[PDB]
Design a protein around this motif. Sequence first.
Motif, PDB file in Angstrom:
ATOM      1  N   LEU A 383       0.940  -1.209   0.075  1.00 39.53           N
ATOM      2  CA  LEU A 383       0.019  -0.045  -0.028  1.00 39.53           C
ATOM      3  C   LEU A 383       0.863   1.246   0.048  1.00 39.53           C
ATOM      4  O   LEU A 383       1.518   1.358   0.892  1.00 39.53           O
ATOM      5  CB  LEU A 383      -0.989   0.015   1.126  1.00 39.53           C
ATOM      6  N   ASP A 384       0.691   2.247  -0.813  1.00 34.97           N
ATOM      7  CA  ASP A 384       1.377   3.130  -1.156  1.00 34.97           C
ATOM      8  C   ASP A 384       1.033   4.673  -1.491  1.00 34.97           C
ATOM      9  O   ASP A 384      -0.058   4.655  -2.239  1.00 34.97           O
ATOM     10  CB  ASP A 384       2.705   2.947  -2.408  1.00 34.97           C
ATOM     11  N   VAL A 385       1.304   5.535  -1.011  1.00 34.44           N
ATOM     12  CA  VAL A 385       0.830   7.032  -1.467  1.00 34.44           C
ATOM     13  C   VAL A 385       1.501   7.471  -2.628  1.00 34.44           C
ATOM     14  O   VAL A 385       2.637   7.843  -2.534  1.00 34.44           O
ATOM     15  CB  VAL A 385       0.936   7.927  -0.360  1.00 34.44           C
ATOM     16  N   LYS A 386       0.851   7.480  -3.703  1.00 36.01           N
ATOM     17  CA  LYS A 386       1.323   8.013  -5.029  1.00 36.01           C
ATOM     18  C   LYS A 386       2.126   8.975  -5.107  1.00 36.01           C
ATOM     19  O   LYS A 386       1.837  10.326  -4.557  1.00 36.01           O
ATOM     20  CB  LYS A 386       0.115   8.190  -6.134  1.00 36.01           C
ATOM     21  N   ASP A 387       3.433   9.124  -5.454  1.00 35.45           N
ATOM     22  CA  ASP A 387       4.313  10.223  -5.660  1.00 35.45           C
ATOM     23  C   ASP A 387       4.602  10.577  -4.095  1.00 35.45           C
ATOM     24  O   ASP A 387       5.051  12.031  -4.129  1.00 35.45           O
ATOM     25  CB  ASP A 387       3.700  11.031  -6.588  1.00 35.45           C
ATOM     26  N   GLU A 388       4.536   9.815  -3.119  1.00 44.48           N
ATOM     27  CA  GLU A 388       5.099  10.637  -1.858  1.00 44.48           C
ATOM     28  C   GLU A 388       4.172  11.852  -1.523  1.00 44.48           C
ATOM     29  O   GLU A 388       4.702  12.648  -1.133  1.00 44.48           O
ATOM     30  CB  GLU A 388       6.458  10.827  -1.602  1.00 44.48           C
ATOM     31  N   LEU A 396      -4.159   6.988  -3.253  1.00 49.98           N
ATOM     32  CA  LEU A 396      -3.453   5.346  -2.873  1.00 49.98           C
ATOM     33  C   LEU A 396      -3.371   4.404  -3.849  1.00 49.98           C
ATOM     34  O   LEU A 396      -4.166   4.197  -4.286  1.00 49.98           O
ATOM     35  CB  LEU A 396      -3.993   5.263  -1.407  1.00 49.98           C
ATOM     36  N   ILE A 397      -2.251   3.932  -3.976  1.00 48.38           N
ATOM     37  CA  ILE A 397      -2.241   2.728  -4.958  1.00 48.38           C
ATOM     38  C   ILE A 397      -1.291   1.628  -4.400  1.00 48.38           C
ATOM     39  O   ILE A 397      -0.870   1.834  -3.334  1.00 48.38           O
ATOM     40  CB  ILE A 397      -1.254   3.056  -6.484  1.00 48.38           C
ATOM     41  N   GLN A 398      -1.023   0.659  -5.205  1.00 44.49           N
ATOM     42  CA  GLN A 398      -0.207  -0.456  -4.793  1.00 44.49           C
ATOM     43  C   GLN A 398       0.981  -0.359  -5.704  1.00 44.49           C
ATOM     44  O   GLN A 398       0.921  -0.213  -6.735  1.00 44.49           O
ATOM     45  CB  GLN A 398      -0.887  -1.940  -4.948  1.00 44.49           C
ATOM     46  N   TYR A 399       2.148  -0.452  -4.974  1.00 43.78           N
ATOM     47  CA  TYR A 399       3.605   0.024  -5.768  1.00 43.78           C
ATOM     48  C   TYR A 399       4.468  -0.983  -4.950  1.00 43.78           C
ATOM     49  O   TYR A 399       4.511  -1.425  -4.165  1.00 43.78           O
ATOM     50  CB  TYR A 399       3.886   1.376  -5.526  1.00 43.78           C
ATOM     51  N   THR A 400       5.703  -1.025  -5.858  1.00 43.68           N
ATOM     52  CA  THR A 400       6.851  -1.980  -5.516  1.00 43.68           C
ATOM     53  C   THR A 400       7.441  -1.449  -4.300  1.00 43.68           C
ATOM     54  O   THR A 400       7.366  -0.404  -4.045  1.00 43.68           O
ATOM     55  CB  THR A 400       7.658  -2.050  -6.594  1.00 43.68           C
TER      56      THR A 400
HETATM   57  O1  LIG Z   1       4.698   6.396  -9.099  1.00 42.12           O
HETATM   58  C1  LIG Z   1       4.730   5.803  -7.938  1.00 42.12           C
HETATM   59  C2  LIG Z   1       5.851   6.007  -6.959  1.00 42.12           C
HETATM   60  O2  LIG Z   1       6.195   7.526  -6.844  1.00 42.12           O
HETATM   61  C3  LIG Z   1       7.326   7.583  -6.008  1.00 42.12           C
HETATM   62  O3  LIG Z   1       7.508   8.920  -5.821  1.00 42.12           O
HETATM   63  C4  LIG Z   1       8.118   9.557  -6.787  1.00 42.12           C
HETATM   64  C5  LIG Z   1       7.439   9.857  -8.060  1.00 42.12           C
HETATM   65  O4  LIG Z   1       6.883   8.687  -8.689  1.00 42.12           O
HETATM   66  C6  LIG Z   1       7.905  10.721  -9.223  1.00 42.12           C
HETATM   67  O5  LIG Z   1       7.067  11.001  -9.933  1.00 42.12           O
HETATM   68  C7  LIG Z   1       8.684  11.797  -8.678  1.00 42.12           C
HETATM   69  O6  LIG Z   1       9.301  12.511  -9.493  1.00 42.12           O
HETATM   70  O7  LIG Z   1       9.640  11.657  -7.172  1.00 42.12           O
HETATM   71  C8  LIG Z   1       8.918  10.717  -6.363  1.00 42.12           C
HETATM   72  C9  LIG Z   1       9.839  10.150  -5.192  1.00 42.12           C
HETATM   73  O8  LIG Z   1      11.290  11.157  -5.240  1.00 42.12           O
HETATM   74  C10 LIG Z   1       7.407   6.824  -4.887  1.00 42.12           C
HETATM   75  O9  LIG Z   1       8.559   6.783  -3.942  1.00 42.12           O
HETATM   76  C11 LIG Z   1       6.875   5.539  -4.801  1.00 42.12           C
HETATM   77  O10 LIG Z   1       6.493   5.038  -3.542  1.00 42.12           O
HETATM   78  C12 LIG Z   1       5.688   5.291  -5.631  1.00 42.12           C
HETATM   79  O11 LIG Z   1       4.652   5.930  -4.898  1.00 42.12           O
END
Ligand SMILES: OC[C@H]1O[C@@H](O[C@H]2[C@H](O)[C@@H](O)[C@H](O)O[C@@H]2CO)[C@H](O)[C@@H](O)[C@H]1O
Length: 461
Positions: A383-388, A396-400
């Motif tokens: 369980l992950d918060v998209k793009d932090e 919220l998405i599922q991510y590696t």
């Molecule tokens: O795409 C999901 C992925 O995002 C990471 O966060 C990245 C993000 O993807 C990127 O667009 C941005 O430029 O930087 C972010 C982090 O520095 C998350 O870390 C990861 O957990 C996923 O959520």
Amino acid sequence: EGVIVNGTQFKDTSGNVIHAHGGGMLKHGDYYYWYGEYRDDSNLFLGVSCYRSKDLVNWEYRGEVLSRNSAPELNHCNIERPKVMYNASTGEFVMWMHWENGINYGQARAAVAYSKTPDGKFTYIRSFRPMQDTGVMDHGLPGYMSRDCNVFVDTDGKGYFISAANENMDLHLYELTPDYKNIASLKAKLFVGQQREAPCLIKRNGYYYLITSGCTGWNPNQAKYAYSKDLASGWSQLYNLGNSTTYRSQPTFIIPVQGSSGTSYLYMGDRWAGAWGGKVNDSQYVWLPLNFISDTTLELPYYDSVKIDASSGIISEYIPDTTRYKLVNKNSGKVLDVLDGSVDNAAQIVQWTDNGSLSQQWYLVDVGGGYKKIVNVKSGRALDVKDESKEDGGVLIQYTSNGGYNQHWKFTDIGDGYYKISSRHCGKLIDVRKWSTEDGGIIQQWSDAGGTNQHWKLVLV
Ligand SMILES: OC[C@H]1O[C@@H](O[C@H]2[C@H](O)[C@@H](O)[C@H](O)O[C@@H]2CO)[C@H](O)[C@@H](O)[C@H]1O
């Protein structure tokens, strides 16, 4: 119990710390052979150890296939990143490596050795800067510079040696002669002026992949990768792999682990002790599975503990507590689920009717403090918060798994078996968008408003 603990120093069957830093691996016959080097008291080349195993977890000491006694110039020198490749034609194992004076790094040259047996005493041949006879000069000396290196055997049986040339600014892919012991030609120059190190060359489905690292000494950095249909040309741009520090390690080698179920590519790395002012021999190892979302999309997740079954050819995450769970929303009565029950990466998280499906089952992996990892069952993604994101409405998405704080969740008991699951990144709770009460309701991130759409019940299944 074929489980490995990353960030540590693996111990052999004898109960002693394995010392194969910057090493590699070769699969021949019924055994996987792990080679590597290690310094001594003067931080100089002592020997190139060799470990043997069938399960890839329990390693047996086989002695030094190469020693500082194997040759006169091996007495006082630096040898790092030794790799071993097998030759079908000859039937002998050829070994390549990086050689230095032990006084400095001016002699950027490669070294070669070989043996009739894998765990037998190798016979050192020579050290040299590739293309020495061509007369070409590379920064004061004749022959291309050759530091961080690695080997690769193609499907057609052609051997390849890759190393960092031109002051580690360029990567040189050398094609080896049929005997693997010499250089036949300069196949291609890769990623010029981009300064990539610790290269790892592999192949999957007519696609060549090059996993590299940055040039920042001991300091871990952002690892990257590229692909191409041909070694000569057609290489893509660099794509980020792992996090900003490659999970506190540096790539060293990647081998395909084939079994009954299929093939799982294993990633090897080094957590150099130099990062915290320790000696090379105090360096730890980091092994992770290299997953292929697509022929052009690669994934390198971080599991604090990895389970391996070489027999079946499966490399996955090790879950300490296999207890399955369902997250039921107080307001809607729906449970936490993945959109269309997809196992794809970055798949949207939604609420859905309790149907006892796999997509609606989650593990809970403790990760220190009061925080935990919420991992899907149908897909090992977390369980992950998209793009932090730190904003309200953050999807919220599922991510590696990447050890990011946007994947750590703390459970706060509010009574009656309900909790407020807050993120470690900003502290916002898992929220059902717009108090939705229907199927497909978007699960998001929102401030603690005390709403019932933010309250979840943990139910065993
Ligand atoms: O795409 C999901 C992925 O995002 C990471 O966060 C990245 C993000 O993807 C990127 O667009 C941005 O430029 O930087 C972010 C982090 O520095 C998350 O870390 C990861 O957990 C996923 O959520």
